[PDB]
Ligand binder design. Structure first.
Ligand SMILES: *[C@@H]1O[C@H](CO)[C@@H](O[C@@H]2O[C@H](CO)[C@@H](O[C@@H]3O[C@H](CO)[C@@H](O)[C@H](O)[C@@H]3O)[C@H](O)[C@H]2NC(C)=O)[C@H](O)[C@H]1NC(C)=O
Ligand SMILES: *[C@@H]1O[C@H](CO)[C@@H](O[C@@H]2O[C@H](CO)[C@@H](O)[C@H](O)[C@H]2NC(C)=O)[C@H](O)[C@H]1NC(C)=O
Ligand SMILES: *[C@@H]1O[C@H](CO)[C@@H](O[C@@H]2O[C@H](CO)[C@@H](O)[C@H](O)[C@H]2NC(C)=O)[C@H](O)[C@H]1NC(C)=O
Ligand SMILES: *[C@@H]1O[C@H](CO)[C@@H](O)[C@H](O)[C@H]1NC(C)=O
Ligand SMILES: *[C@@H]1O[C@H](CO)[C@@H](O)[C@H](O)[C@H]1NC(C)=O
Ligand SMILES: *[C@@H]1O[C@H](CO)[C@@H](O)[C@H](O)[C@H]1NC(C)=O
Lengths: 494, 494, 494
């Protein structure tokens, strides 16, 4: 007697997934949605190269530390790369005011151009070539920051400087200047003539007065003196006014600056790779559409959500053993190779496996749609994650840390449990589809066949391969065989 | 050829929903939980009107910029509305110290009353009516901030001012004063007699000393001088002590202030609408119990969660085609109008429809309960979202931006995937209810009935319409009919 | 006549759960995953005791308010406990600079040792014991901070102090000093001889100059004078240099400091309980593996996620009523006691209950695994939640408040909806298991038994207890009884 059986795909896969109720469940196909790979390279960000200060800090680069070795200034960059402890930074010891805000402002710059705004010819009554220190050596000779001029008395006199510069360019000007804290009255009168001095700086918004602190300090880079640097953004058609009778570190060069987007400073030792990316980490770039990653927290760009997890494996295929699906249908079919759910016939032209095209295709569509929903519903926007707070801003640094940790906890929990729940529902989806197929066949045949209890029906008539693929194609004629079935059904012993 | 069939509700609805596995699925009823509408108006917040500063800033309003409204009498407000760039703000150029913290303090005030604390009679040895400037015109002629007094020398002398004020009121006092940075020694001697001057201010907590910075600056509103203003909160029974020999901008009016909660500053040009609301946005107010909205991020009040989404549509009804639904039941019944699941019979009396009332009521209750759970479990508390950090606080503002973006991403992902998953579970719930109905009669009928294979049953006797409503009301009597059925059953072959 | 029935566990439990579709559903067993209990004590944190300042503030403890203990007996601590308003705090009025950052630095200290760095023998030409005030009582008599020295003129002279201290220890040194703001020229010359004075402090990084503000102030603790204190971290092998000609409040003691982690300051009056914990709240400690709690927001340690909820009750057992459960199987069996799903048989030998162990064990395993997944997938890391921003940092405090509120909203919503959805699915899981068991038996028996419509089958042959235990084990011998069954079936009809 001919029979027809309902079954499902099996294969050689050893891939495992977890569900909310079961762990280490072998399946026929799975997919990780957690991005774990990076190119180990520093790349352009959306087509724009980073500004890689390799042996210089932002401060030394800006002021023109003569000990920083190379300076092919670039007119635009997407982020700044410093390494962890730059060797060259403020050769003469001191400070750059509002340094962290300045670095954040310079993180991403649309246009950057160094220009000469006050040449040394502007100081006819002051010495312009002796403002030089062994703390800032160039090629064995004492020197100084190149973009600023350390003015010194001339003929034992330091006349009061009163000068102004109008920003006649059409871009903002980043301007830097400084004041020198000398060590004692003798050094004060040696460098400048006047013992009590000041530096006044004024713009439309700036109203600054600095007085040197002549006091004992510890030696740093061989110097007990200090130099405090300050900066401003001079808008077009505004003028900056300087006045000073000593200790003035005057601007010489400044920077035309056009700023649009923001970014941060990345600390990294990885090397530039002539690549492009939308998501950069300090150990490499990420090219991924996945919603989650575990590579590094300090990312710049449009990145997946950072989670603490080793794998996020969604089940795509069926339960695999290399109620349905290991219930009343005892097991899977390695023999069925071209589908997920299908049939196995046996008449007397032969045996074979044949996949049910329609339910297999709709289950594949549904599982693919589920994966694509878990991926595509993730909103990813540009974010720049750095560490931009100083030693006296640790409360804000802790606020940021609590924010980062909270978002990591939220995303980790949500992703893990989403994977578990949707894996369990995918396996149940397979179970219900298989049972629905068995019932579709049961309702095509009714009492022209006997249920055998293992997923198979036994025909009360002969069912040729046209009758068989008519059972698969949805095309079984019950009233036709109604009596070939009738007579063999009542002819049953025993 | 008598028949009875199991079926479900259908209608003309074209509403679509998405599930995690299927897109654009038409259903009989749906409900959006995403709020997308606003009244386009600025409203009271929980019964308290906002302080709408027309074309004036908080600074100009507080100090009494003469182009600012002096006849402003709002003793209470819930939030402040500024325009993007107010025209009237510090007519005489300069600064108001801790301006952003002061605006945050003033965001929501329970009581606000301007009072005279130091009358102009208090300065007998100084000129009180010469402190007037073209930078602060009233009706085109020179004037000054109205709540503060620019004291000028008298008879070429400026005696040292030593004055105090004890807060004998019962509320905190917001007190403002200032110092004038003159331009040169000549102007210094012209306005005040003394070349070297100061302003000292003392309370229980304040210990302030201000010295004028006499230097060259750029012209702003026609003035190269500056005025730096400062403020304090004088607690009841505490006294403020002022001392100065020049450049003093003395208090005249101050503000009794009672604060019982915070809010923020809203930037908006939308107009007041004499309305009330629990959630205000810069483009309109929101009246909604929904858990999510997509109108605007900078909201004040008890608002739904802001997400980046165009619709969040939950399925309430069933799959609509204008292992059950679209499985063996070819389609739904437009004819059944008063329920979700039910029956359709056809015998010699006629055909008709009857809904299974009790499973229909339980499905409606469950779907309504699911919608109400997705809505009611949302915790919504008061939050005030603004932009309160200045140009040199970009790191903190980026921290706030990262927080807002992270919460938007979290809520968007969670809402989208919750809607998808619960829609899939709702549709499967309908499928299971219909299959359970197909089975409930099958087990009431057993071998008193024949399965017909497309959702319909065949009776093994003819069953009057009282027997039918016994099949539906749960009380069909099997030993009643069993041998009328068995004798005719043993007769249909055929 | 012989029968076998499918049924499920019941008991007398009245515990209720909610699902996303049903409220107040009685079940056989439930489990709350919300931690709600605390031990009402302040405990060690991961083995490290807290530093409990009793009625002293960090300022009074550090400077040595004579009413404060030395708190030298704890060399390490995990967090600091202050009362809401410490009584002993800066007895002489004034300020401690960067006080909040200093408290954050001192929140958790790995090693802490008070050492003498400048003994009073270092001041041979200054008075060291007259710096005493009624604002700083010891036993009702005027005194002063003990770890700092109020230097006063000697023989109507105050020679210029120039002193240095080299950090010859191998840990960082916390060093504090101050300046005294006198009230008038007469008091200035009375305490120090020189009318115009200064204090200069220098290290490798510090470059500070302080000038006294001689001005009129309000009385605080009976004094109109003030004292402004400052602090620095002197790194090993660096030296601090002090210079001053008056008003100098000089250091005597300092603190060796070893820091390895941070924390926060907890405000609490609860007492130390000689306990240990991983999560501390201001009202008691928490010992819990649960993922959520509702006890208190200001926690320190590895805590559950704080949510706004009274219960998060997951269903573990079955639906209990003292589409299977209440579908065709009318109700549960109080009589069946060692299983969840099972059978009830009746033949010649007797009637009894027998659990289907295999489905019972895997359902128990799955439910336990679901609970353990909801618990274990929670990532919990160390966090310290305090209130560390001052009266002029309300914008940052509001940013932190918005972050905390946002995370509470997220966690509350997610936990509530997770419990609702997983309760739904657990109940549906039980129903599906019962239906699968009924189908296992139905497909073993086929036409050797009649379905009875209530969960029971009636045998068309005699089924002894071995035949019964073959039906339970899934291995019923259909061809063995099939022909007796067909003959008795053809006999009974009829
Ligand atoms: C910095 O330099 C610019 C000049 O490059 C200064 O702005 C200039 O101001 C003059 C008048 O103040 C403008 O001239 C023209 O004057 C007639 C008056 O009859 C007026 O009708 C024209 O529309 C125009 O205003 C000149 O265009 C303008 N230049 C620019 C580039 O705006 C500026 O004031 C200087 N800043 C300081 C602080 O000195
Ligand atoms: C401000 O004024 C009030 C009184 O107008 C002062 O408070 C009084 O202080 C004396 C003690 O010296 C008490 O006997 C009175 O009962 C107080 N009066 C009130 C109304 O409280 C207060 O000290 C003054 N403050 C300052 C800084 O001078
Ligand atoms: C400050 O203290 C340090 C610690 O001893 C001194 O550094 C040592 O100096 C001696 C001699 O110069 C060396 O042999 C040691 O190797 C140094 N130790 C370290 C860790 O550097 C330092 O010289 C002291 N400075 C002063 C001015 O006394
Ligand atoms: C799951 O499999 C891995 C090996 O691939 C094993 O290390 C782990 O312990 C397994 N987990 C359980 C719960 O059996
Ligand atoms: C769903 O419908 C919208 C129009 O209502 C259409 O734009 C969109 O492409 C449709 N999506 C699919 C997958 O058919
Ligand atoms: C659930 O039970 C509690 C008391 O046990 C009751 O207060 C509450 O109203 C009940 N909920 C419903 C929906 O009946």
């Amino acid at each position: 007697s001919d029979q027809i059986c309902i079954g499902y795909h099996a294969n050689n896969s050893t891939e495992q997934v977890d569900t909310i109720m079961e762990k280490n469940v072998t399946v026929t196909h799975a997919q990780d949605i957690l991005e774990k790979t990076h190119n180990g390279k520093l790349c352009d960000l959306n087509g724009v190269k980073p500004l890689i200060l390799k042996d210089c800090s932002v401060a030394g680069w800006l002021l023109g530390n003569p000990m920083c070795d190379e300076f092919i200034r670039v007119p635009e960059w997407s982020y700044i790369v410093e390494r962890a402890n730059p060797a060259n930074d403020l050769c003469y010891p001191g400070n750059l005011n509002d340094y962290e805000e300045l670095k954040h402002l310079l993180s991403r710059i649309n246009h950057f151009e160094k220009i000469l705004i006050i040449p040394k010819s502007s100081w006819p009554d002051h010495e312009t070539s002796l403002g030089v220190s062994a703390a800032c050596p160039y090629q064995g000779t004492p020197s100084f920051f190149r973009n600023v001029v350390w003015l010194i008395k001339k003929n034992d006199a330091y006349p009061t400087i009163k000068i102004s510069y109008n920003n006649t360019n059409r871009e903002d000007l980043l301007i830097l200047w400084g004041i020198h804290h000398s060590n004692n009255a003798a050094e004060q009168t040696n460098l400048y003539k006047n013992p009590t001095t000041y530096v006044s700086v004024g713009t439309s918004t700036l109203n600054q007065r600095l007085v040197p602190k002549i006091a004992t300090r510890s030696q740093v880079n061989g110097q007990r003196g200090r130099m405090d640097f300050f900066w401003t953004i001079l808008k077009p058609n505004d003028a900056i006014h300087f006045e000073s009778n000593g200790n003035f570190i005057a601007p010489e060069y400044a920077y035309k600056i056009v700023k649009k987007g923001d970014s941060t400073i990345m600390k990294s030792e990885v090397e530039y790779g002539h690549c492009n990316t939308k998501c950069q980490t300090p150990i490499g770039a990420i090219n991924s559409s996945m919603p989650f990653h575990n590579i590094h927290p300090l990312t710049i760009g449009e990145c997946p959500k950072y989670v603490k997890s080793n794998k996020l494996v969604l089940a795509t295929g069926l339960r695999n053993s290399p109620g349905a699906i290991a219930g009343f249908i005892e097991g899977g079919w390695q023999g069925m190779v071209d589908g997920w759910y299908g049939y196995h016939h046996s008449n007397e032209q032969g045996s074979g496996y044949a996949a049910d095209k329609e339910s297999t295709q709709k289950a594949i569509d549904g599982v693919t749609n589920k994966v694509n929903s878990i991926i595509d519903k993730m909103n990813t926007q540009f974010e720049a994650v750095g560490r931009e707070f100083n030693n006296l801003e640790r409360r804000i640094e802790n606020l940021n840390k609590k924010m980062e940790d909270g978002f990591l906890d939220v995303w980790t929990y949500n992703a893990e449990l989403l994977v578990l729940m949707e894996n369990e529902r995918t396996l149940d989806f397979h179970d219900s589809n298989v049972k629905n197929l068995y019932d579709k066949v049961r309702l095509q045949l009714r009492d022209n066949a006997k249920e055998l209890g293992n997923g198979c029906f036994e025909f009360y008539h002969k069912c040729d391969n046209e009758c068989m693929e008519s059972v698969r194609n949805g095309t079984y004629d019950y009233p036709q065989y109604s009596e070939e079935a009738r007579l063999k059904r009542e002819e049953i012993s025993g």
